[PDB]
Amino acid sequence: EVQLQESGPSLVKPSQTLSLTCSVTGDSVTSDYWSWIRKFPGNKLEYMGYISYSGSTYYHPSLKSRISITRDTSKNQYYLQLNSVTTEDTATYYCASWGGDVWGAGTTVTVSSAKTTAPSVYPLAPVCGDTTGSSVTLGCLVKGYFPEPVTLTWNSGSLSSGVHTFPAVLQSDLYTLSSSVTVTSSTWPSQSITCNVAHPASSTKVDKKI
Amino acid sequence: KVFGRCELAAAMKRHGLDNYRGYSLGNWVCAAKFESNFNTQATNRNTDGSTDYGILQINSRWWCNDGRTPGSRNLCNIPCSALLSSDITASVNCAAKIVSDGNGMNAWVAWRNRCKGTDVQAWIRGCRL
Amino acid sequence: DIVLTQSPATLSVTPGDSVSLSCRASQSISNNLHWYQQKSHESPRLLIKYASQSISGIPSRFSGSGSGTDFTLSINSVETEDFGMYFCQQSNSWPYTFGGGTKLEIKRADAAPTVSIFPPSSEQLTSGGASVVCFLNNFYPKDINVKWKIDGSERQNGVLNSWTDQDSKDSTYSMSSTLTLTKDEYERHNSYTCEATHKTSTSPIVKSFNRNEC
Numbered sequence: 056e057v058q059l060q061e062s063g064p065s066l067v068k069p070s071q072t073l074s075l076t077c078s079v080t081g082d083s084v085t086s087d088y089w090s091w092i093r094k095f096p097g098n099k100l101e102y103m104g105y106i107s108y109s110g111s112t113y114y115h116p117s118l119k120s121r122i123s124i125t126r127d128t129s130k131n132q133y134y135l136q137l138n139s140v141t142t143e144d145t146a147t148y149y150c151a152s153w154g155g156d157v158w159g160a161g162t163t164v165t166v167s168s169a170k171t172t173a174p175s176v177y178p179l180a181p182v183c184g185d186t187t188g189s190s191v192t193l194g195c196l197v198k199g200y201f202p203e204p205v206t207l208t209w210n211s212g213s214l215s216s217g218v219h220t221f222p223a224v225l226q227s228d229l230y231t232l233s234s235s236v237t238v239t240s241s242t243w244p245s246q247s248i249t250c251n252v253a254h255p256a257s258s259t260k261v262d263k264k265i
Numbered sequence: 266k267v268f269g270r271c272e273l274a275a276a277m278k279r280h281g282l283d284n285y286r287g288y289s290l291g292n293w294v295c296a297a298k299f300e301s302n303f304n305t306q307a308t309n310r311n312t313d314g315s316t317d318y319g320i321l322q323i324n325s326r327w328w329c330n331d332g333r334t335p336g337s338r339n340l341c342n343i344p345c346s347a348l349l350s351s352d353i354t355a356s357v358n359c360a361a362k363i364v365s366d367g368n369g370m371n372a373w374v375a376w377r378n379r380c381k382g383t384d385v386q387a388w389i390r391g392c393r394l
Numbered sequence: 395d396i397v398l399t400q401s402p403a404t405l406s407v408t409p410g411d412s413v414s415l416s417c418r419a420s421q422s423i424s425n426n427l428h429w430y431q432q433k434s435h436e437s438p439r440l441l442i443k444y445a446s447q448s449i450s451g452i453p454s455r456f457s458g459s460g461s462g463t464d465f466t467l468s469i470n471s472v473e474t475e476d477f478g479m480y481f482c483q484q485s486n487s488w489p490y491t492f493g494g495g496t497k498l499e500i501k502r503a504d505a506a507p508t509v510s511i512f513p514p515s516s517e518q519l520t521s522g523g524a525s526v527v528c529f530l531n532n533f534y535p536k537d538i539n540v541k542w543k544i545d546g547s548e549r550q551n552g553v554l555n556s557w558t559d560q561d562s563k564d565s566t567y568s569m570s571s572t573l574t575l576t577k578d579e580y581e582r583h584n585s586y587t588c589e590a591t592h593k594t595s596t597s598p599i600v601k602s603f604n605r606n607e608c
Contacts, residue, residue: 086338088365092438098479100438100492108327108340111367115489116395149437153362154342155428155483156449158437179512179527183608192510196518196525196572219531219568221556226574231554233570235510235529279461281424281444285486358444361426361485 056081059150059159066202067144067166073137077150077159084131088153091124091135093146094161101146105153106133140166165202169228173257174200176250178265179233186240193243193265194235195250200257201229208251209236266351268303268320270294271392273353278394280357286364291385292376293360297321298388299375305356306349319348319356321373328359396421398482398493406501406535409474415496417482419463426486429458429467433478434559441480442467472498477560499536502565506594507533511587511601514580524580526573528588528601532566539591540571541598545583549573580605 063075077089090105104114106124114122118137126133137144144166151158179194181187197205207220220234236248243265253260268276274294277283283290300322301307309317315326315334325334329345341359348356363372370376397420407413417427425445430438442458443449445465455470467480477500482493507530514524530538536557542549552575558568571588587602 083338087340087342088362098481098495098497100481100483100495102483102490102492107366108338109366109368113365113367113488117489151438153365155430155438155440155443156342158439161437175518175521177515177518177525179515182511182513182603185608192508192529192531194510194512194527194529196515196527198518198523198525219529219558219570221558221568221570224554224556226554231572232556233527233529233572235531235570237508237531279425281426281486283424284422285424285426286488354447358447365485 057087057152057157059152059157061148061150061159061162063162063164065162065164067140067164068168069141069166070139073135073140073144073164073166075135075148075150075162075164076132077134078130078132080131084126084128084133089124089126089133090151090153091148092151093148095143095146103135103137107153142166167201167228169201171256172199172201172229173254173259174198174205174230174252174261176252176261176263178250178263179235180265184244186243189240190237191240191243192235192237193248194233195252195263195265196231196233197223197252198226198231199229200231200254202256203230205230205232205252205254207232207234207253209234210247210249211251214238214248266305268297268305270298270303270388271394273297273303273320274389274392275394276353277357280353281361282357285361286369288364288370289386291388292370292380294388295380295383295385296370296373296376299379300373305351305353308349316345318345320353321348321356321360322375323348323356323359323363328363395489396423396484396487396491398484398491400480400482400493400496402496403494404497404499404536406499407472408501409476410471412471413469413498415467415469415480415498417460417465417467417493419465419484421487422462423484423486425461426484427458427460427465428483428485429456430481430483431476431478432481433475436478438481469498499560500565502534504594505532505534505566507531507538507569507590507592507599509588509590509599509601511603513586513603513605514577519577519580522577524575524577526575526580526586526588528571528573528590529568530571530590531568532561532564533568533592533594534566535593536560536567537593538567538569540569541589541591542571542573543585543587543589544573545585 088107091103123136177196217237223230223232330339331345429442512527
């Protein structure tokens with residue numbers, strides 16, 4: 056019945072401190088050894104460290120100095136502190152039992168100095184409207200936003216088949232993503248196709264007719 | 266089951282204690298010798314209502330649950346009965362966790378008093394393991 | 395620090411097939427090696443502990459073997475829900491370390507990509523930028539090479555690629571490749587091409603357009 060859950064700021068600025076809390080439920084924080092593991096892009100896992108029953112800690116040497124793991128027996132939580140972070144500390148952080156039998160869902164922490172920025176949304180249409188075969192692929196380029204995520208739909212959701220929306224990538228500190236939609240040549244341009252992009256962080260939502 | 270010295274050394278080696286977290290196999294054989302004379306069924310009752318179980322005499326107050334020990338923490342998340350088997354699997358798994366605390370093998374007083382600092386490798390010499 | 399090397403980096407199989415994943419240690423770690431599974435958007439799950447010990451509640455089709463520096467995770471007839479990442483982790487010495495992982499993916503018939511290229515929009519150009527986008531959709535297997543050429547010269551700077559996970563619907567893969575330039579750079583050239591090389595043909599798929607002769 057033991058469950059774990061990570062919580063804390065999702066964004067940290069370079070040189071500042073990253074703080075995460077792991078809430079333990081079902082059993083006491085003193086009933087096990089507890090750990091912090093993070094996963095960098097590219098499926099690279101790093102065992103950051105653990106705190107055992109005596110309160111003693113073991114920290115990964117590559118971090119050593121910047122990291123601290125502590126616990127609060129009254130709240131039944133344990134914590135992670137990682138100082139002087141840089142972009143390279145961007146990762147998914149998990150708290151887990153030393154035995155590995157229980158893991159939190161994980162929480163993403165991004166390190167960046169970027170400020171909230173709404174995306175520019177551009178229509179992607181065939182070179183000078185030339186429709187080739189029996190089908191046509193159109194697209195939408197979402198560029199220069201921060202932070203993730205954005206939600207993209209086609210025709211407010213009424214065009215959902217034949218769609219490929221790709222993962223965002225970082226371009227000069229800002230995110231960019233694109234989506235392609237394929238329909239029959241008898242469908243477009245006879246029927247309008249519009250890209251709708253919402254960016255919650257900036258409370259924006261824009262439509263772009265192709 | 267009462268293990269022979271070399272027989273236990275070979276089993277502990279198969280169970281990963283040779284050079285686990287910096288401890289040579291000799292430490293574990295010597296520890297087992299002083300804790301239980303290599304007897305998997307060894308038990309010792311303490312004044313606080315807890316009992317030490319197995320070849321490495323693991324306590325029911327902190328490490329295992331026997332269903333009748335006050336203040337049970339069950340750090341190894343295992344029933345103490347699992348620590349009395351002729352199969353050392355459970356006792357080693359638990360020992361491997363106990364020793365992962367900062368106190369290391371100092372968790373076993375008998376080890377500190379009778380093994381720590383000596384020529385522990387003497388315990389496995391002569392063994393064809 | 396102990397290094398764990400897993401092989402192969404990826405393996406594609408059909409449900410029902412049985413597989414063996416390798417994990418090798420740079421130093422002997424006796425039996426202190428553990429196996430984890432991590433499916434998409436889920437947390438890691440411990441499958442085997444101490445090289446070969448079973449964990450109550452894990453399907454019987456998963457088993458582990460090995461000792462020292464050579465370990466194997468075996469799966470008896472892979473099931474539809476077993477696709478994802480598998481990692482090994484050692485606990486013999488601090489710091490604990492993980493292998494790079496092996497990706498278990500679904501095998502299906504080869505399929506060439508459908509490629510589409512797009513010039514910069516009038517709106518981006520007005521803003522002073524110029525992105526050229528190329529979509530390569532529903533292909534299999536996943537390995538593919540994309541090359542950009544401007545006026546006959548291969549171009550690497552300004553290219554960013556993005557890949558989707560294996561498609562839940564048809565087990566194919568899709569990719570977007572984008573070449574971002576400034577309006578000034580874009581207007582200084584004419585021919586824009588993105589070429590895709592995939593095992594489905596010795597001839598690369600070429601999509602292109604000329605900025606001054608649509």
